[PDB]
Amino acid sequence: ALTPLVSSSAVVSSTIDVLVEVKASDDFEVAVPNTPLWLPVDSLTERP
Amino acid sequence: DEQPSQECIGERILSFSELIKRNSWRYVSDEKSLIYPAYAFDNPAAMYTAADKLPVWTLTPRSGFPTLLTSIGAMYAFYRGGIRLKIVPGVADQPKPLVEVALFTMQDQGYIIKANDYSTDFCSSNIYENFVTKGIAEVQTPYYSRVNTSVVSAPVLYNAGNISPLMPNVMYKITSNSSNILLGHSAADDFRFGFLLGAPLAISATALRDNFTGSSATVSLPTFSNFYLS
Amino acid sequence: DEQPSQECIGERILSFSELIKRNSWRYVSDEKSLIYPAYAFDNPAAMYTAADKLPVWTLTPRSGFPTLLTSIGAMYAFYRGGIRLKIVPGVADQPKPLVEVALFTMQDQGYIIKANDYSTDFCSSNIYENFVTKGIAEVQTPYYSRVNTSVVSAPVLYNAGNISPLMPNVMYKITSNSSNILLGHSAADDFRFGFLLGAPLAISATALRDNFTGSSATVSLPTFSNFYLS
Amino acid sequence: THSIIDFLERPQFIGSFLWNTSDIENKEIFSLKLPDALMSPMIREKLSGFTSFSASTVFHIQVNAHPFQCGRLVLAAVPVPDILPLHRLNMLSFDVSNVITLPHVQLDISKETEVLLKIPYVSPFVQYDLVTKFTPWAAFLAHVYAPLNTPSAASLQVNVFAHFEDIKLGFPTSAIVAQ
Amino acid sequence: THSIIDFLERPQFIGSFLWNTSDIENKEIFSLKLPDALMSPMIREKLSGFTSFSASTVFHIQVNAHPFQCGRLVLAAVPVPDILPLHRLNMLSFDVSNVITLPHVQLDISKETEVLLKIPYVSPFVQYDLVTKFTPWAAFLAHVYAPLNTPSAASLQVNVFAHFEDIKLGFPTSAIVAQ
Amino acid sequence: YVLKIPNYFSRFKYSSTSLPKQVLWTSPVHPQIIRNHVTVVDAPGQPTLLAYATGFFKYWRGGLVYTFRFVKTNYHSGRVQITFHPFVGYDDVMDSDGKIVRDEYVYRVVVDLR
């Protein structure tokens, strides 16, 4: 931050959410495919 | 710049289409004669726990374990095209070395794994491969679908039998003379996935060796090592 | 004048590049299922003595014995490119004649030999060869490196695991059904060594049969003869 | 006008080293690590704010012998010292011949007052990691080839000067120059 | 490629300064000396090895007021502060009008979120003496023109950013950057 | 196609509280971005799409497109600097007070919220 988020507490919340998304750039590359790090399932649950 | 990929890797990969032509293992059976549901793309149901003296993770496969194929497929809603099938033997039975894979289409039969009972399904597409001479059995499977667009892991139903439109209404009948057999599949040449959704429900794989509850890691996967040594 | 070479030898050799494509033997194992560190290029540590009733020389291999490959490599600092791998069996197991070599990449695993424990490393690059029908297993291995220039016999560290940049972060998982197995390697087509340093630390080979201390020559090498007859 | 490079191209006095009658064949006069040996405050200041860098490296060795003193040095280079298989590193301290095989240059004090050597950046890493400080990419070393041969015992100062060339800097950063 | 200048041209955060309702006409928010205020380690490092330097100087002032707050600042410049006849220096703290006469720019928070000012090097000396440190050649100052006018008392952060331009370096030296 | 699909992976808050140079948010720059399972609470967690995909390989390289959305009205006003610090971890970017360190030395991206 550089400045506090100065606002009129009189009519607006003095705190706000900031959302962050990511995607890959153009130059993005991967390689060496093998056993994956992740493994997919049809459901996940606690054991009895 | 495609320099790094040529200087270090020696290849460069651009679509999962490329990847899913690599054959990965799916499921194991003890049945000499088995009915397998080719276009089943489900994955196991998982169970986690923190409590002492309990195996941390546990996996209930409905139709098999995650292949590259299914692992990828999870991301998409639809599929079309055909698939390949690879088969490995516990036993190279010198005097009965043969394998039959046959096209199985019985209408009433249910679309999940089951041992062969039918003795009366004459005149079907039969491929034969010799376990002794050619170590592995290799097969290709037409999409043979009632529709142009099928669904990833379609919820099968009790008497969806083998005529659900949401898949190709076709299964494998595999009759070997190895007690134990190891199944794997990649996608065929013409195969394609459709309508990307997001990440699928998933958990670390490297994590499946967790045993911090003292109770040792039980859950194993169908790999060659695990199969061939029993 | 290239006359002599044509009149007597029948060939004429100009670079070690030529030589290191010849497959030489490296190491032996008793493990049906083994994890080998492909790009290990170390050689044994040696011990000499003059005292009576002691074997003169003795050799402690960390990752194997000198192949042409490593023997040469010792002269250079760096390497790049891929390698070949040849495998020989104690046992042509008729009913389980198969070999798996698979690409092994587990991040935490350590970059030195160890017997396979993991049962949960699904969907990896797997090659299969049939020991019965094709006597030997033959394989090629991509450089698959994180960098364009790797180091001859990089000092591995306790948890350098399998992600050290100074090598390709890749190993072999070899699952056979021969109790005993003999490993060998040559360099691949694209392989190259770099930055010549001088002679490496070395000792006469013919000398390894020394027994002047009375105590007979113990130290043997992985050759075919030595393997096949046990 | 002036620029960062100009500084790294500046030739620094690195050290004076003793070499005396008693020193014998393959006796090491010095063994200096790249880039460590050049990392003077001057350099560090200007390299500050950058993740890493690579360069070729120039080495002037200076030896002011007088007419009646004969002797002979090697100056050689060796890569990535930190991670070379020990047997190599040893072979060097063992036998001068395993230095003569290297990238080197000989110096004969009777003839020459000086000689140079240039060493390119060579490594798996594309630059010297200035934060991780991961492996100095080479090292110069001066073993005695033929020992200093005065009638009566005496000793001589081997000076070293050096700078970079063909310089390349990494992305800039709030990370700090490795101590 | 990179060069010393590039660093001095880099715009630094110089300070955040409080300005609140109570602050009154001609109340000084800050008074920053050139070059002192910009002499961060980063700069000092790169300026090391040089007798002196001169430059124009860019000043961004940042004030994130919200719609219902009105107020007004001056940002002005003044030369060679250290040696100006006192009465001048005083006249500035005395009366905002003697700042309005200066080289300055006004800022109205309701309209503008920011404003700049550039200041050339101006001095008897041709450069800032980096060893003698003899007279900072100017100083920026921000007096309040029209006080912050919220209904109920409140306060606001005045940020400052700045860098050099039109840079010129002196002969290089073993003398050290004045503390 | 796939890796360029946006993965929402994190949020935070900006407020009246927040102070000059106060770090508000950090992330290491890499593709293995993860979430928490809802059902249970394992350590590994639920991978983002990106992570899941990249997960099929060992090696990666390239740049990443990060996107910030400031859910606000016009009657908010403030500035924020986004900065990237290569070769340094998220503890080391802020001093003991949670104030940013040596911002001077990098790509800086000022954002006026007016």
Give the number of domains in chain B.
Answer: 1
Alpha helices per DSSP H over chain D: 4-8, 41-47, 86-94, 97-100
Reported resolution, Å: 3.6
In chain B, which among 83-142 make CB contacts under 8 A with chain A?
Answer: none
Note whether C120 contacts B209, CB cutoff 8 Å. yes
Q: Does D87 touch chain E (CB under 8 A)?
A: no
Distance from F35 to chain D by nearest Cα, in Å?
Answer: 28
The residue length of chain F stands at: 114
Give the Cβ contact number of residue B136 at 10 Å: 17
Burial category of B198 from C-beta neighbours within 10 Å (exposed 0-12, middle 13-18, buried 19 and up): exposed
Identify the CA nearest to C118 among candidates B225, F43, B203, F44. Answer: B225
Contact residues on chain B for A46, CB-CB shorter than 8 A: 47-49
Note whether B16 contacts F2, CB cutoff 8 Å. yes
Distance from D46 to chain E by nearest Cα, in Å?
Answer: 6
The conformation of residue D175, written as its DSSP 8-state character, comes to S
Assess whether chains F and E touch, using the rule of 3 or more C-beta pairs within 8 angstroms: yes
SS3 assignment, position C113: coil
Task: Write down the experimental method used for this entry.
Answer: X-ray
Distance from E1 to chain A by nearest Cα, in Å?
Answer: 22
Q: Are A37 and F24 in contact (CB under 8 A)?
A: no
- For chain D, give percent helix, strand, coil, nearest 5: 15, 45, 40
CATH number of the CATH domain containing B46: 2.60.120.20
List the single residue in F with minimal CA-CA distance to B204: F44
Which amino acid, residue D116?
Answer: L
Tokens 């350098």 sit at which residue? C160
Question: Which residues of E make CB contacts under 8 Å with A?
Answer: 13, 16, 62, 64-69, 156-157, 159
Q: How far is CA B50 from CA A35, A40, B221, D112, in A?
A: 26, 20, 21, 76
Domain boundaries, chain D: 1-179
SS3 assignment, position B207: helix
Tokens 């109570």 sit at which residue? E22
Note whether C144 contacts A36, CB cutoff 8 Å. no
Identify the CA nearest to D47 among candidates D169, D179, D163. Answer: D169
Distance CA F37, CA F41 (A): 6
Strands A43-46 and B45-48: parallel
Q: Does D5 touch chain E (CB under 8 A)?
A: yes
List the single residue in C with minimal CA-CA distance to D79: C77
Distance CA D66, CA B197 (A): 83
Q: How far is CA B162 from CA B108, B115, B173, B175, B191, in A?
A: 6, 15, 13, 19, 21
With the CA atoms of D62, D65, D67 and D70 taken in that order, what torsion angle do they form, in degrees rounded to the nearest 10? -100
Span between the terminal Cα atoms of chain D, in Å: 30
Chains that touch E (3 or more CB pairs under 8 A): A, D, F
Is the peptide bond between A48 and the residue preceding it cis, with omega within 30 degrees of 0?
A: no
Q: What is the DSSP string of E17-80?
A: EEEETT--TT-EEEEEEETGGG--HHHHHHHTTBSEEEEEEEEEEEE---TT-EEEEEEEEEE-
Q: Are B129 and B174 in contact (CB under 8 A)?
A: no
Chains that touch D (3 or more CB pairs under 8 A): C, E, F
Give the Cβ contact number of residue E18 at 10 Å: 11
Distance CA C118, CA D175 (A): 39
Structure tokens at D146: 């033929």
Q: Are E81 and E89 in contact (CB under 8 A)?
A: yes
The conformation of residue E176, written as its DSSP 8-state character, comes to P
Note whether B16 contacts F52, CB cutoff 8 Å. no
The conformation of residue B216, written as its DSSP 8-state character, comes to P
Side-chain-side CA neighbours of C111 within 13 Å: the count stands at 24
Assess whether chains A and D touch, using the rule of 3 or more C-beta pairs within 8 angstroms: no
Contact residues on chain F for A28, CB-CB shorter than 8 A: 3, 60-64
List the single residue in A with minimal CA-CA distance to F81: A1
Domain that holds residue C199: 1-230
Identify the CA nearest to C86 among candidates C210, C211, C227, C216. Answer: C227
Assess whether chains B and C touch, using the rule of 3 or more C-beta pairs within 8 angstroms: yes
The fold for domain D1-179 equals: Jelly Rolls (2.60.120)
Give, in degrees to the nearest 5, the angle at Cα C176 between C171 and C178: 130
* Contact residues for F4 (Cβ-Cβ < 8 A; gap 6+): A23, A24, F65
In b/e form, how buried is each residue of F64-83, taking b as 16+ CB within 10 angstroms? beeebeeebeeebbbbbbeb
Give the Cβ contact number of residue B134 at 10 Å: 13
In b/e form, how buried is each residue of D131-152, taking b as 16+ CB within 10 angstroms? beebbbbbbbbbbbbbbbebee
The residue length of chain E stands at: 179
